């Protein structure tokens, strides 16, 4: 929107806002990230520490799919239960949630669970996640 650009308010002002002494010159500091270790060293060290150097080890031909493990916490397992089936239950009778049908591979343990037992059926799980599920009275099932 050219009508709100501020250069339209500096018309009639000689320098267009860039100063009389230090002008608007072409590339007075160099182009791009020139001088990251010479004359932009303070800026690179201050705002981007860790920028220079080589850490760790290479992984020729990395495929992301090999590393895919979506995760869900136990605090979110009861939104997964439909209400009518959340009603059908006894003290020993609990719903079973295949988190694999919701796109999750591992179950993590953040958050609280209600007293109602649950049977989480997952590919992977953490220590605490099963410790919290058992403490609610439910069980864990491993699948593939």
């Amino acid at each position: 929107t050219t009508r709100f650009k501020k250069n339209r308010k500096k018309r009639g002002h000689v320098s267009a806002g860039h100063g009389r002494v230090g002008k608007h010159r072409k590339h007075p500091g160099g182009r791009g990230n020139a001088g990251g270790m010479h004359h932009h060293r303070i800026l690179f060290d201050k705002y981007h520490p860790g920028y220079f150097g080589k850490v760790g080890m290479r992984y020729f031909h990395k495929l992301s799919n090999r590393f895919y493990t979506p995760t869900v916490n136990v605090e979110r397992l009861w939104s997964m239960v439909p209400s009518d089936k959340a009603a059908e239950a006894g003290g020993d009778k609990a719903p079973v949630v295949d988190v694999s049908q919701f796109g999750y591979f591992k179950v993590l343990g953040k958050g609280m669970l209600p007293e109602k037992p649950i049977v989480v059926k997952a590919k992977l799980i953490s220590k605490i996640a099963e410790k919290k599920i058992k403490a609610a009275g439910g069980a864990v099932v491993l699948v593939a």
């Binding site: 791009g32 981007h48 920028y51 090999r66 439909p82 089936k85 609990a94 058992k134």
Partner: protein, 205 residues
Amino acid sequence: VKHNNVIPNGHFKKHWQNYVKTWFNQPARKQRRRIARQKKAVKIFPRPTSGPLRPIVQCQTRKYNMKARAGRGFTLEELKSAGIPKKLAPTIGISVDHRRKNRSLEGMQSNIQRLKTYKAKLVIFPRRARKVKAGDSTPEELANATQVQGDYMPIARGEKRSVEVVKVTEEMKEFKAYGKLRVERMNQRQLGARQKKAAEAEKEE
């Protein structure tokens, strides 16, 4: 370069303005493809406009092996088990894939049932006017025949979400899910050292 910003990394140092691709012909592309589809539909009428039948396959790569999609074509065993000869299938609307394999029985069974399901609802006109050879159909059938459009055999991508209710039994509560994973990971990494200690047993002992 100046104030706390992200490190700039734009790849604009070549003669990029000579390879700018704009999309002003996108609405015209849709129309040409629509006319192409429409013109194709008439020249294949009454054959279905989606194309030949595609089998169910599981996708590759961990991330997707839980999802089913359409594959290129039926294997030779799937074709022969359903009793559709190798060189007749493309002529009646069924694609073939001489390269795909059947490593797991369930996949083979699923795609066999599709061929019978397709064969059940398939109708074939005679090659001439009055002669009815093998595989042809009744005149009543050939008048009720229209050009079906869309996906006449849909593929469900994966398992429907079901949250059943069961009773949590004492064995279920005793099972250590985390303990099972760690001991099974343990066995995997000791596989060589165990086999080596075993292997050297028969070498020396």
